[PDB]
Design an enzyme around this catalytic site. Structure first.
Site: not given
Ligand SMILES: CC1(C)S[C@@H]2[C@H](NC(=O)CCC[C@H](N)C(=O)O)C(=O)N2[C@H]1C(=O)O
Ligand SMILES: [Fe+3]
Length: 329
Positions: A209, A212, A214, A268
């Site tokens: 990923f 980004h 948060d 991150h």
């Molecule tokens: C780094 C993170 C913790 S944060 C990053 C990424 N973040 C998102 O997609 C936001 C999700 C919002 C959620 N669906 C909502 O409607 O509130 C994800 O998933 N990622 C995680 C990952 O891949 O671990």
């Molecule tokens: Fe994140």
């Protein structure tokens, strides 16, 4: 070569109590971490994180393709136009390794006026069949409130750290209207692991990923013990070490906005790791109409020229933007 980020372990247990000086000492640590890398681990937090990762494991491993379609968000199932946020996020074998299940405020029911009004970002949670997943919904909803209680306390620490009364943020974080979400993410072990599911960063790091900030006020994250996260500093990305007993905490872009970037939203990313693991973030969002007046802790008058932002509109824009930039999860 890749260095390691300073991510202090902060005993946050005084934030639940009435020793006000002890809370200020916690607040100072949160302030220092927020001004350094932007991450810290909350320890002595009172949540049973072992049961959290157990219940989460049995769910991901026992849910079937039929159930996944039945619960899928509209990005995967055109029949479910009301499920933008809440529901199942399917993996795509050979293409996308990650899958997840997101749920929202349990108080979002057909009775809730935000549901009646069809206000964006409010949805009624969808759940698997109780008999196929006994106790899952009960565990999930109780976990929502367990981590809600922790986040409220953490928000009192941030408020004191910024020179405010302890309810400056928490007053806007309420069970009746919070837009906070839990996401239960599974990262699988795959052999062979599909290269199409791996992105290559500018510096060559293989990623699950991309970078980004948060979309949250703060993010309260439990992860199993597999190192994967990196935080960007001026000297490049630095590894965040794992700790499957603490909660990794970071500010979201709403905090950066209201503090005039005094507490930055750390950038991150998620390294690619071929390992079965869990990532269970709680995104601390306020209510749809919640507005916090920006201020600048660097200025004697504390004045900021920045416009107050309604949290609902911030969230609607932020979620769509993150999808566009980093892809549908
Ligand atoms: C780094 C993170 C913790 S944060 C990053 C990424 N973040 C998102 O997609 C936001 C999700 C919002 C959620 N669906 C909502 O409607 O509130 C994800 O998933 N990622 C995680 C990952 O891949 O671990
Ligand atoms: Fe994140």
């Amino acid at each position: 070569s890749v260095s390691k980020a300073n991510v202090p372990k902060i005993d946050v247990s005084p934030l639940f109590g009435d020793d006000q000086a002890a809370k200020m000492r916690v607040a100072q640590q949160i302030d220092a971490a927020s001004r350094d890398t932007g991450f810290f681990y909350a320890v002595n937090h009172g949540i049973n994180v072992q049961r959290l990762s157990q219940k989460t494991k049995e769910f991901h491993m026992s849910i079937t393709p039929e159930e996944k379609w039945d619960l899928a968000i509209r990005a995967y199932n055109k029949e479910h136009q009301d499920q933008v946020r809440a529901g199942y996020y399917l993996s795509i074998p050979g293409k996308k390794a990650v899958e997840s299940f997101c749920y929202l405020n349990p108080n979002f029911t057909p009775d809730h006026p935000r549901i009646q009004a069809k206000t964006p970002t409010h949805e009624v949670n969808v759940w698997p069949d109780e008999t196929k997943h006994p106790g899952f919904q009960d565990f999930a909803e109780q976990y929502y409130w367990d981590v809600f209680g922790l986040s409220s306390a953490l928000l009192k620490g941030y408020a004191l750290a910024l020179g405010k009364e302890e309810n400056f943020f928490a007053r806007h974080f309420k069970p009746d209207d919070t837009l906070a979400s839990v996401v239960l993410i599974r990262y699988p072990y795959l052999d062979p692991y599909p290269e199409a599911a791996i992105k290559t960063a500018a510096d060559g790091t293989k990623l699950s990923f991309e970078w980004h900030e948060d979309v949250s006020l703060i993010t309260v994250l439990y992860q199993s013990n597999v190192q994967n996260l990196q935080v960007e500093t001026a000297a490049g990305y630095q590894d965040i070490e794992a700790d499957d007993t603490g909660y990794l905490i970071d500010c979201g872009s709403y905090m950066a906005h209201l503090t005039n970037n005094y507490y930055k939203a750390p950038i991150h990313r998620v390294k690619w790791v071929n390992a079965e693991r869990q990532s269970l973030p709680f995104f601390v969002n306020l209510g749809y109409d919640s507005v916090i007046d920006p201020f600048d802790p660097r200025e004697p008058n504390g004045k900021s020229d920045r416009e107050p932002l309604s949290y609902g509109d911030y969230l609607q824009n932020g979620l769509v933007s993150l999808i566009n930039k980093n892809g549908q999860t």
